[PDB]
Amino acid sequence: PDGQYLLKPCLSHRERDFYLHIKDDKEWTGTGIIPKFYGVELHEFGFGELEFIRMENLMYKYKRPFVLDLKIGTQTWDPETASSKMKKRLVVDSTSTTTSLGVRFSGMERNIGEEKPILYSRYLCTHEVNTRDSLKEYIKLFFNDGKKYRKELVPYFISQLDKMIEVMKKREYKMFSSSVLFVYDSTTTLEDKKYNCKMIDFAHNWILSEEECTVEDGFLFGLNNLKSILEDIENEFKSL
Numbered sequence: 527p528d529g530q531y532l533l534k535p536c537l538s539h540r541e542r543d544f545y546l547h548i549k550d551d552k553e554w555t556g557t558g559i560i561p562k563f564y565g566v567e568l569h570e571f572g573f574g575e576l577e578f579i580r581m582e583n584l585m586y587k588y589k590r591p592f593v594l595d596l597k598i599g600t601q602t603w604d605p606e607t608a609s610s611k612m613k614k615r616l617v618v619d620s621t622s623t624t625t626s627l628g629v630r631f632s633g634m635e636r637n638i639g640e641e642k643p644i645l646y647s648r649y650l651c652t653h654e655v656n657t658r659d660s661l662k663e664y665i666k667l668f669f670n671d672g673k674k675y676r677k678e679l680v681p682y683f684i685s686q687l688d689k690m691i692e693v694m695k696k697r698e699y700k701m702f703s704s705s706v707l708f709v710y711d712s713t714t715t716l717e718d719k720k721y722n723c724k725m726i727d728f729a730h731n732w733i734l735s736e737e738e739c740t741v742e743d744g745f746l747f748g749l750n751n752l753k754s755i756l757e758d759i760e761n762e763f764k765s766l
């Protein structure tokens with residue numbers, strides 16, 4: 527995460543279709559809930575051209591990145607998932623907080639000045655981060671910049687989740703294996719606004735006005751659960 531942009535290759539139609547579909551909905555593009563979308567672009571690849579999505583790099587100019595990926599939904603497979611992945615998906619969904627909370631730990635990075643950064647594997651989700659309490663603890667740890675808890679940032683994160691909930695309440699799309707990405711630069715001040723919370727990874731988004739998706743995503747359920755964990759954190763951080 528060095529430069530201004532992420533140029534993400536389109537390996538299927540779904541992500542690019544989604545971004546294109548919502549590119550004029552100000553509820554998607556004006557609310558600050560997804561990365562700024564610049565456009566789909568062809569770039570030379572192979573004998574021809576490969577399509578990419580150009581979007582903002584949410585960590586552009588971050589000095590000490592803090593990154594937390596939280597995968598949202600009550601399942602992480604959809605009607606197109608390959609049978610050869612399904613046993614694993616079913617097991618991970620059930621042994622992580624996915625089926626119980628609709629949200630799971632997906633990985634974290636903290637840069638506390640002794641770099642290299644401290645990396646926290648997404649595989650922790652089925653053991654160390656397999657309960658609501660342990661998930662709460664790990665989010666609190668994300669807010670630990672190495673010297674203190676950044677309690678002043680939490681209202682921003684809850685406010686972002688509220689906007690997400692507001693739009694997803696409308697149930698126009700289903701989204702599987704998408705995440706909410708939490709980031710901040712620990713050298714930020716509140717005024718520098720080097721912190722962010724966005725929905726990402728729309729490679730399995732279904733546009734319900736153009737196609738049927740029978741299975742439920744539990745997306746809204748997950749966002750509410752995550753919001754309530756943050757609100758607990760906001761309380762736990764008061765005694766500090």
Ligand SMILES: Nc1ncnc2c1ncn2[C@@H]1O[C@H](COP(=O)(O)OP(=O)(O)OP(=O)(O)O)[C@@H](O)[C@H]1O
Binds near residue numbers: 532581582585593726
């Ligand atoms: N717009 C962005 N700005 C900054 N970092 C990003 C952005 N999008 C993604 N990332 C980083 O890249 C990671 C993976 O992103 P994403 O989920 O979109 O990738 P992917 O290629 O779809 O991989 P997978 O499906 O395996 O998760 C995220 O956890 C996040 O750390």
Ligand SMILES: O=P(O)(O)O[C@@H]1[C@H](O)[C@H](O)[C@@H](OP(=O)(O)O)[C@H](OP(=O)(O)O)[C@H]1O
Binds near residue numbers: 611614
């Ligand atoms: O969502 P997509 O686009 O299919 O891609 C999957 C995504 O990268 C998952 O995080 C990964 O699980 P891991 O994090 O365990 O690697 C999975 O591997 P899988 O095929 O082993 O389930 C991939 O198929």
Ligand SMILES: [Mg+2]
Binds near residue numbers: 726727
């Ligand atoms: Mg992803």
Ligand SMILES: [Mg+2]
Binds near residue numbers: 727728729
């Ligand atoms: Mg993906």
